[PDB]
Design an enzyme around this catalytic site. Sequence first.
Site, PDB file in Angstrom:
ATOM      1  N   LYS A   1       0.756  -1.142   0.215  1.00  0.00           N
ATOM      2  CA  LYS A   1      -0.236  -0.018  -0.296  1.00  0.00           C
ATOM      3  C   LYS A   1       0.549   1.397   0.048  1.00  0.00           C
ATOM      4  CE  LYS A   1      -1.775  -1.899   4.105  1.00  0.00           C
ATOM      5  NZ  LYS A   1      -3.429  -2.050   4.783  1.00  0.00           N
TER       6      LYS A   1
ATOM      7  N   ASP B   1      -5.117  -6.173  10.255  1.00  0.00           N
ATOM      8  CA  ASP B   1      -6.415  -6.031  10.520  1.00  0.00           C
ATOM      9  C   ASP B   1      -7.978  -6.870  10.152  1.00  0.00           C
ATOM     10  OD1 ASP B   1      -5.996  -3.925   7.437  1.00  0.00           O
ATOM     11  OD2 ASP B   1      -5.273  -5.734   7.710  1.00  0.00           O
TER      12      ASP B   1
HETATM   13  O1  GLC Z   1      -5.664  -2.988   5.554  1.00  0.00           O
HETATM   14  C1  GLC Z   1      -6.091  -4.295   4.315  1.00  0.00           C
HETATM   15  C2  GLC Z   1      -4.854  -5.377   3.493  1.00  0.00           C
HETATM   16  O2  GLC Z   1      -3.779  -4.430   2.964  1.00  0.00           O
HETATM   17  C3  GLC Z   1      -2.283  -4.930   2.329  1.00  0.00           C
HETATM   18  O3  GLC Z   1      -3.468  -6.105   1.227  1.00  0.00           O
HETATM   19  C4  GLC Z   1      -2.233  -6.080   3.346  1.00  0.00           C
HETATM   20  O4  GLC Z   1      -1.013  -6.095   2.717  1.00  0.00           O
HETATM   21  C5  GLC Z   1      -2.677  -6.564   4.132  1.00  0.00           C
HETATM   22  O5  GLC Z   1      -2.106  -6.968   5.758  1.00  0.00           O
HETATM   23  C6  GLC Z   1      -4.124  -5.884   4.961  1.00  0.00           C
HETATM   24  O6  GLC Z   1      -5.178  -6.687   5.785  1.00  0.00           O
END
Ligand code: GLC
Length: 450
Positions: free
Chosen positions: A161, A197
Amino acid sequence: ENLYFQGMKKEKVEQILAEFQLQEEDLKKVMRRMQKEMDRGLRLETHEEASVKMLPTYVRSTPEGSEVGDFLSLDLGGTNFRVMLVKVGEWSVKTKHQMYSIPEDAMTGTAEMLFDYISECISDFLDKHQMKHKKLPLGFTFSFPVRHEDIDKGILLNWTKGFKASGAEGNNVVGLLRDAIKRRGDFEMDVVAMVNDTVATMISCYYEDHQCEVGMIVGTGCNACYMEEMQNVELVEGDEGRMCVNTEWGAFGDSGELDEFLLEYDRLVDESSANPGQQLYEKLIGGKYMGELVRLVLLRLVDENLLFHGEASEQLRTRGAFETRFVSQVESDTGDRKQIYNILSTLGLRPSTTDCDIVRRACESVSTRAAHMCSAGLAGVINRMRESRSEDVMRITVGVDGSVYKLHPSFKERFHASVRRLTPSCEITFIESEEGSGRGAALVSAVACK
Ligand SMILES: OC[C@H]1O[C@H](O)[C@H](O)[C@@H](O)[C@@H]1O
Ligand SMILES: Cc1ccc(NC(=O)[C@H](CC2CCCC2)n2ccc(C(F)(F)F)cc2=O)nc1
Ligand code: NA
């Protein structure tokens, strides 16, 4: 004002937008490929090569003993950094909360800068509520792929991200946090747990509905977790009960699994991202990329002289200027085009009624594909669970958080209908988390600190 030419323009736009279509057979193929990678990620033999990591979280069914009192919950990875004070009893209630914007220099600088900033925010929160001297158990929601050794120890596999802080990948994330707290030395915390999360969402929703055994995020990024049978979790010794597995499904496609579905817009977004060639499935759905995909669709339509008289403003040619929230706002337009006109006018454009309609179709095309691709992932997880549990009819709850799922006017509806078509003999209830991260992380921390 020539209605015949307006119709011909809209017809040419439809021929271009048709590329985004995914038939039920395409979604089943993505689902089967997702299930094959999930099988691969859970096995000792193929884990290292698997694109979908299926990471053990050390969150288990029937944990037994739980402590009571005040818990501090942190959240890094979504939008901003959050600090929350949670009271756990019997129950779990959010008593105090504060959100801090992370400076760009801390998300892309050194891990020391990032964790120093995190520690400064913790110091600020404890002062606002007069509790700096009080040593509380701390739970950390950290929204990135982590290889856990236990609930309170795990290495960052890679940033996702757009995060890029040097000196973090390959290190114990709990250690990075503890080290930064100690360098400041103006408070003490017992870091007892670290959770994804998705995991925190599943737990906060489980608190309201005991059938919730799946957590999904559709926000900046996209990922899911679920309660797997310990016998199938080959990376953790033991075959009794269940353990939550963080799929990290965003990395599906990183080994070529989505190649036939990737469009020119996907290739451009990927190439201009902080992590080219990584998180390819996430890049088809996540809010960090959705608006940008629409922006690139609009530029193609501008180039074909189908939109804005074949002229793109400086703002429309600006990276990230078509925000994902504009995609949701455009699709919320009642039909009068006022909402669409406002966004486009602010972007330095002088849109016609036809331009507004075309922009709406481009938004619908990208968001529908995001809903459909996401549905194939969730259907793969749910179908796999029904099979592993030897259930004729599986009744399950999915806990969901994230701005795309919660705020987009139609993503939810399109997503639910598609998941349902792909999940014969499943009765799926979808629930939205209420201050998901904080409560979930504190319930895990209560167990972790005995
Ligand atoms: O935040 C939503 C998701 O974003 C990205 O995919 C991260 O790698 C993952 O760990 C997280 O759960
Ligand atoms: C170190 C460690 C190991 C295991 C755990 N597991 C839990 O906390 C589980 C997780 C759930 C079990 C299936 C879905 C997720 N849980 C969470 C909340 C609640 C309640 F809501 F009742 F408080 C009951 C409960 O059993 N936590 C920490
Ligand atoms: Na096991």
